[PDB]
């Protein structure tokens, strides 16, 4: 039988987030679950239709297909401004390799429609690599791409439990590459790791080591599109830094504003094609409470960097070298997690004790319910 649902969450990364969907297992007896879902937050609106058979084979090889659209407003994501309205479709085979490992292979089509781009160097350098030459003096522009991708995934999951894990690791590797026929020509790889090492026999004292790695680049003379950039900074990556602040900052053309007869530095983040995060976090028994097993308290050390491997310092000797990977940001702080009656809740307070020019601080961060 089927169901419908709606949800509200809230966080510093997203603002208020609304979800709603209808779902039906085994729709019309086809063996496919069918879902229609939408999600909206301060900067994004997304909807999809999914059709999924978890037992495409009797061994639990899964087949899924989706249609989707997306409206993304970069300025509301604390980035330099552009609008990206896209849509597409994908198909994914899910392979259970063993208890701890699954693989994913998929093909995807996506149409990206970029407009309202505030002219800036890194963005225009991408556009030029694409043979596109919009004016640098206004925000009236349009740039459209159609891409076909091969999508791959590997998930390793050997956590003792999913709720407040005390032992084991989770690794997620995702890759994609354009297929000939695409407008864009690039690959992109992401790697997430979390490893929990319990110190005491009761597993109330736990060390979490967390990493994130992102690398993408153009094949041929084309660059990875900026709309596929990685970011860092925020409640879920590097605490104490404003959402997405870490890494290159927009260098605007005469046209934070630059409205000026010269190029203008800014503190608007643009992301980059390379990113790395690492975090060490000590989980301790929750102080001045007792039961205590419904709260998780922790102290952490967070670090991260984002860079632009195609940033051309020689031409722009007067500006920060945004191709430099070594501007490692760091913060220290405390966090609390709790299954609140409004849903899963996390709070953190963290001071960014290493930062660079244009980086913005956000000491107090939180997230309540689903914002993902």
């Amino acid at each position: 039988t089927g169901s419908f649902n709606f949800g509200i969450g809230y966080g510093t990364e997203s603002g208020v987030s609304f979800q709603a969907g209808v779902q039906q297992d085994n729709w019309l007896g086809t063996g496919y679950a069918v879902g229609i879902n939408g999600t909206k937050n301060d900067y994004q609106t997304y909807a999809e239709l999914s059709v999924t058979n978890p037992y495409f084979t009797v061994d639990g090889v899964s087949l899924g297909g989706r249609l989707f659209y997306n409206d993304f407003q970069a300025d509301d994501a604390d980035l330099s401004d552009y609008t990206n309205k896209s849509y597409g479709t994908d198909v994914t085979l899910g392979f259970p390799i063993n208890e701890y490992n699954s693989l994913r292979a998929g093909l995807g089509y996506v149409h990206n429609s970029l407009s309202n781009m505030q002219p800036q160097v890194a963005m225009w350098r991408y556009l030029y690599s694409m043979g596109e030459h919009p004016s640098t003096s206004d925000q009236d522009n349009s740039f459209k791409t159609d891409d076909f991708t091969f999508n791959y995934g590997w998930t390793y999951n050997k956590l003792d439990r999913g709720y407040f894990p005390t032992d084991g690791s989770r690794v997620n590797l995702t890759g994609k590459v354009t297929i000939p026929g695409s407008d864009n020509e690039y690959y992109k790889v992401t790697l997430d790791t979390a490893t929990y090492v319990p110190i005491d026999d009761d597993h109330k004292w736990v060390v979490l080591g967390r990493t994130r790695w992102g690398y993408g680049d153009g094949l041929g003379g084309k660059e990875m599109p900026f709309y596929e950039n990685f970011y860092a900074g925020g409640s879920s990556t590097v605490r104490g830094f404003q959402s997405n602040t870490i890494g290159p900052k927009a260098v605007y053309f005469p046209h934070y504003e630059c409205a000026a007869k010269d190029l203008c530095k800014s503190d608007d983040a643009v992301g980059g094609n390379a990113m790395a995060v690492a975090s060490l976090e000590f989980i301790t028994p929750t102080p001045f409470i007792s039961d205590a097993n419904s709260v998780r308290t922790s102290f952490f050390w967070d670090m991260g960097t984002v860079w632009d491997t195609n940033w051309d310092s020689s031409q722009y000797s007067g500006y920060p070298d945004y191709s430099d990977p070594s501007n490692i940001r760091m913060s220290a702080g405390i966090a609390l997690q709790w299954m609140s009656p409004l849903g899963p809740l996390v709070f953190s307070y963290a001071q960014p004790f290493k930062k660079y020019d244009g980086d913005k601080a956000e000491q107090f961060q939180f997230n309540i319910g689903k914002t993902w």
Binding site: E13, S14, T39, N41, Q44, Y46, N70, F72, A77, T155, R170, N172, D192, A194, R210, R212, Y227, Y231, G234, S235, S236, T237, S243, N244, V277, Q337, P344, V346, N367, T371, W372
Partner: peptide, 14 residues
């Protein structure tokens, strides 16, 4: 990939 770490900016495949 894990609550509450590495939320995508371009949602929502987490």
């Amino acid at each position: 990939f894990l609550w509450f770490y590495h939320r995508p900016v371009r949602g929502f495949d987490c």
